[PDB]
Every structure is written in structure tokens, then in C-alpha cells.
Structure 1
Amino acid sequence: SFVEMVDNLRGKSGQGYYVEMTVGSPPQTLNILVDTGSSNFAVGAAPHPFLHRYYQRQLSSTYRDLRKGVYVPYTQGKWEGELGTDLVSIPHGPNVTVRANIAAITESDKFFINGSNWEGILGLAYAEIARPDDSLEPFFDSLVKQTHVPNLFSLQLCGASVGGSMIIGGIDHSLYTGSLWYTPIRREWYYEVIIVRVEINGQDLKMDCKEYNYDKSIVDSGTTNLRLPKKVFEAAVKSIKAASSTEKFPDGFWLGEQLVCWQAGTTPWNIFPVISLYLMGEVTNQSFRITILPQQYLRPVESQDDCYKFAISQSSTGTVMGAVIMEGFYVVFDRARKRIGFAVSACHVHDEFRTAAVEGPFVTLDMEDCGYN
């Protein structure tokens, strides 16, 4: 039942959202980072200074060795380990046990985060980007094949402790307001989408829309930031700077290298622009927009100052709609209908004159054009 899954995510501010899972017989409990940017399920399986527990394959009677090594690189770090299968279940998830591929992590480099409270990663994207190749069936594909869990999940990430929900197999309408707006999944590898327009405080960034999606645009729960191609990042930083040029920010602030601080309760939110991303819609010449507030992209780093990191950053690998974007929203990963839905979440943060929004319909032409090939 869906209420069972409401509030099944936890985390620490800026350290990742995780769901509880059990691997093996008898069940070993682990906290697993929810990652829509990858397709491998992997767990700490050897001692590590940042780990408080790990998978113990020797203690599981249902463990099978696949007798294959694996390496998974990401933007932020990488791990290697050994491939196996085992029985997996999600306590605040559907009432099922599946046999799934699990990579036992045996070494890693800048992967685990000290104090984050998670010991593994659930990659929820498609087999096309699984390591070492697309025949290593991802967890969610195993789940759907082996149970009657519908081929859909949703993510409500509640930011600024963190919490939220991963609704497995469905949409929980008590968790958002207004209507869901859907964008096509362009290709089933990452959750790839097409951005057709960008506005900052209502002013069109006016770039060729190909720039927004060079060389892809994805929805990624495992990445903190809004990550933007170089040209777009520069255009956007230039606008955000102009809008806030009432105030003094070291150039390292704009690079996420340094924090800005304000006497508690005096953050000048009004001087930071809203950002609207327009997404390709479901119908011919249809688009919709999602609007994010400064509070999403100025992330509080916890002295009686309020201090913040700038959480829009540059990318050489396309646009990444990270938790910065997703925190405003209820996000439906509707794999069965090849689409991603956005609605404003019931847990949206509160500006007192401005609102995170999902609005449509808009008309926009040759959204063809925006796709990078």
C-alpha cells in the first residue's frame, strides 16, 4: 500500500537521499542512496573508514557468486568490486523479495561520504548504462520482471536532516498539488529529457536550445547540483550576478568553492532570481515549465550566520537536473509510458512572495531542434 512508502527516504543535508534495504538470508539491513543517474546496485562489502556496516556475503545462504569483477566510474568518484546475486527486499517498499544483481564494493575512491549514513547505491536508470555492460539487469528491471510491481516509481525529495518518499510502483496523489506535467524520456539510458527554453526572472536566456541539451539533459537524484553545459552556466551566472549585484560575492562563491554568510534571518532572498526550465511536453508544439527558487540553488552549509553554497555548477557531460531541481517537485519516473512527470510537492520550501511552480501548457516550436545529435 502506498502510505507504507511515504516518508521512506532519509538523509543528511547535502549528503544524499537513501532508502532502507535488506540483502540476503538472514536479511542484512543497509541504507542505500537513491540514484536515477546510474543503473548498478552496489553495496559496501569490505571495511571502510566511512562505513558503519557492510554487506557480508559469507553470512548469506542465498548469495551466489557471478565470478566477474566490475568497476563503476561516476562524476564524483568510483568503485570496483565483485558481481553476485542475492535476495533483496525493501522494508518500506512493496511487500516482495527479488533476486537481484549486487556488486559487492571492495574498494572505492571518493565514493562513500563520511557521516552520510548510506552504505550502497541503487542505480534506477536503464540497462544501457549498466556496467560492465547492458546484460547486467538493473534492480528495478528485476523487480518488475519477478513481481507484479508496476513499471513506474516516484521520488519526492524534501530538502532544507532531509526526507521524502520513493513510491515504488505508483503515484501517491496526497504528495503533490495541482497537475502532473509530463516530458518524454528521449532515450532509455539515463532518464534523458529535452529542455526547450530557459528563463531567469522571466527573461529568456535566448540561446540556441541545442545548448541546453549539449550533449544530453538528464534527471539525476544522485547529483546535488543543477549542472549546466559551459556556455549555459556562463549565461546563467551572468544573469544571477546582475540580479544580485546589490551584493558582494567573491568569484569563488560562483564556483561553489566558498560560502556566503548572513546574519541569521537576513538572507536577501529577493535579490536572487527564479529559474524556469521549459521541458518538451506530450503533444505537438507542447511544453511546460518548472520554476525553481533561490532557496533550492543556494544550499545551506551548517556562529549565528546563515551560510550557503552556490549549487549551480558547470558540466562537460550535458545538463544534470540534480536534487536542486527535484527538491521542489514530485517526480514521476513513468517507465511504462516513457515519460517523466513533474508536480509541485506538498513539501516545497517557503519563500513568502514567490512559489516553485509547474505550469502549462506553453506553445514552443521545433522542439525537434533542441535535441542534440
Structure 2
Amino acid sequence: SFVEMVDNLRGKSGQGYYVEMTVGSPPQTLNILVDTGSSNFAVGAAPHPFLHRYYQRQLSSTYRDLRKGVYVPYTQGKWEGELGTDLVSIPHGPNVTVRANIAAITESDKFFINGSNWEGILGLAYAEIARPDDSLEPFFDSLVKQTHVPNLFSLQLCGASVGGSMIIGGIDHSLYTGSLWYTPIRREWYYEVIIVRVEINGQDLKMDCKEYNYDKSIVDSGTTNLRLPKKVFEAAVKSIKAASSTEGFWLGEQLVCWQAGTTPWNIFPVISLYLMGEVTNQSFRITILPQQYLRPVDDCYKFAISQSSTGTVMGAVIMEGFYVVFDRARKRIGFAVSACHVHDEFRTAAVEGPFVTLDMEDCGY
């Protein structure tokens, strides 16, 4: 039941959230990064200087080889390895065992992070973006096909040492407040959504909404940042600079620092994303505070908004403080402020609707 799954995720800031899983017979225990921006279940299966532990296929009696290699590239990092299948379970998830596809990772470049403490990646999106091709059924599909776990999951990620919940199979009503607001998954590959308006401190950014979605906007819990397309990224920074003109960093390369507890939170604006809703001409908005897009790294911070080579990418930083529901069953993603919400002296992060927005169809690429 859901109480066993609450707080089943861990992290280091800016390095991802993982969940304990076990693979094989007998079970090998591994920490697996939870990723909504990809679709391959893969694990280190070979010594690496950043891996404390890895998958030993030859120790497992249920491992079957598929005699077939694979390569997977990501925003940061890439790996290749051998596809097989094996028995998989989630200790603090639903009480089941599935046979799932598994990529034994043999070579990697910039993929494993030093001191990250995860040793694998669970892609939670759809077959279509699965390597080598869409016939390699992704973990979540196998789980839904082979057991009675309903076709949906929720992510509640929290910031500082980093924790949260993956409610697999449902929604835990105690982990958020107010109502859940939904947005169509435009297409079942990435968790693709449409952003229809963007406001900075209450001011519309005045751009054509095709710009926000230049290519595709996605919810990617495997990336840290809020990534905006060039044109939008440039407008955002110009607004954020102006709102904070009162005080290199803007490119995310270097930290800024303040004497413990005097972070001038008030001089940094709130950003509002309006997402397409479930009814005609209707949207809703999520409001993000400086405390989300200035990443805790004296209290020090990295700027967590960077330039994108796709559309708008809602990374780990935007999801922090929200309860997000991946309602695959009904082709929608749900947003609410969670229990572990962001704390500011004079403002709240919020999920507010309904809003009316004409011509939302125009914003799609």
C-alpha cells in the first residue's frame, strides 16, 4: 500500500533521485536513478571508478541474454552495453516481481557521477524513445502488463540530504494539498506538454507561444535545470537580471555566495508557467520561487536555468515542491503543491487555475 512507498527516494542536490531496486536471483541490490526523460532500464555491469556496486549477471540464475548491443545518449553522458532480461523488484514499491529488459552497461562517458551513489537508470517514458528501437518494452510497461499495478505513478521530490516519494500505481492524497491540475500528454514518447504563457513577477514575456515549445517541451526528472529555448532563455535572464540589478553566473558555470542566512530571496522574481488544461481555452499555472531555480550548492547557489536545444524542459528543480502525477492511463500529467513545498517569508509556490487562454493549439510545434 502507499504508506510503504512514501520517502523511498534519496539524492545529492543536482545529481538525481534514486530508488532501491533489486535485480536477479538471488536479488542484487542497486540504487537506480528515476528518469522521466528516457525509457531504458540500465545498470552498471562492470567495474567503474565511480561505482561502489554493479550488476553481476553471472551470479544470477534468471538472467537471459538477448545477444544484442545497445547505445544510449543523454543530455549529459552516454553509455553502451548488452541487452538481456532478468527478474526485478522494488523493495519499497509495490509487492511484485517482474521480468524486465535490462541493459548491462559495459562502457560509459560522463554518465556515472562521482559520489552520486546510484548505479543505474530507470527510464519511465514510452517505447517510442527506447533504444535500440520501440520494440524493447520499457520497465513500466512490463510492470503494468505482468501485474495489477494501475497504469500511473507520482513523483514527489524534495530539496535539502535530498529525498522524496515515487508512488508507483497511484496517488497518495496525503502528500499534496489543494486540487490536482492536469495537462495533456500531447504524444506518448517523452512526457510531452505544451506551455502557453510565461510570466515573470506577474509580467507576460510577450513572445509567441510557439517559441516556448520550440521543438518539444517535456517533463524530465533526470535533468537538474529549467531549460528554455534561446529566445525565451534570453528574455528570462534579461527579466531576472533587471529584477535583481540591485546586486558568468548567469550561464550556470560559477556559484554565488552570501553570509549564512542573508540570501536576498526577495530580489529574485517568481516565474509562472501556464500549461494547457483539460478543457477548451483553459489553462492553469505553476509558480516557481527563487528557492527552486537557485540551487543550494556561507550559503552558496548555482543558477538553475540554462539554455535548451529543444523546447522547455522541466527538470528536477521545477518538480521539487510539486506532486506530479504521470497519469499514463488517461494521458495526462497532474500538478499540485506537495507537503514538502518551498518556504518563503512572503510568497508561496502555487498551482492555480482555471485560466482562460485562446488559440492554445497554435503553441504546438
Select between 191-200 and 313-322 the one with higher mean Cα deviation.
313-322
How far apart, in 2, do the equivalents of 1:178 and 1:162 lie? 24
Q: What is the alpha-carbon distance in structure 2 between the residues aligned to residue 219 and residue 201 of structure 1?
A: 23
**d(CA) in 2 for partners of 1:202 and 1:323?**
24
Q: Secondary structure at the match of 2:190?
A: coil
Q: Deviations over 1:121-154 (max 9, x none)?
A: 0000000000000000000000000000000000
Long gaps (5+) in structure 2:
none
* Deviation at residue 317 of structure 1 after TM alignment: 1.7
> Quick one: distance in 2 between partners of 1:370 and 1:63?
46
Moved over 6 A (4+): none
Q: Secondary structure at the match of 1:296?
A: helix
TM-superposed deviation, 1:160:
2.8
Aligned to 1:14: 14
Cα displacement string for residues 170-203 of structure 1 (whole angstroms, at most 9, x for unaligned residues): 0000000000000000000000000000000000
Conserved in 2, the CA contact under 8 Å of 1:46 and 1:106? yes
SS at 1:255's partner residue?
Answer: coil
Deviations 1:215-269 (A, max 9, x none): 100001100000110000000000000000000xxxx100001111101110000
Q: Matched residues in 2 for 1:225 and 1:130: separation?
A: 23
State the 1:13 CA deviation.
Answer: 1.4
**CA deviations over 1:341-371 (Å, ceiling 9, x no partner):** 0000100121010100000000001100010
Shift of the alpha carbon at 1:319? 1.2
8 Å CA contact 1:198, 1:275 repeated in 2: yes
Aligned partner of 2:73 in structure 1 is: 73
- 1:294 is aligned to 2:290: yes
> Equivalents in 2 of 1:43, 1:253: separation in Å?
34
Conservation of the 8 A alpha-carbon contact between 1:292 and 1:328? no
Q: Unmatched 5+ residue regions in structure 1?
A: none
2:314, 2:15 → 1: CA distance?
17
TM-superposition CA deviations, 1:108-131 (whole Å, max 9, x none): 000000001000000000000000
Distance 2:46 2:133 in 1: 24
Distance 2:66 2:312 in 1: 35
SS at match of 1:253: coil
The answer for the alignment partner of 1:28 in structure 2 is 28
**2:344 aligned counterpart, secondary structure:** coil
SS of 2:272's equivalent in the other structure is: strand
Aligned identity (percent) is: 100
Alpha-carbon distance in structure 1 between the residues aligned to 2:192 and 2:54:
32
Offset, 1:328 = 2.0
With structure 2 as the length reference, what TM-score do the two structures score?
A: 1.00
Shift of 1:30: 0.1
How far apart, CA to CA, are the structure 1 residues paired with 2:215 and 2:160? 31
Aligned to 1:260: 256
C-alpha separation in 1, matches of 2:363 and 2:38: 24
Q: Distance in 2 between matches of 1:15 and 1:332?
A: 22
Please state whether the residue corresponding to 1:325 is helix, strand or coil: helix
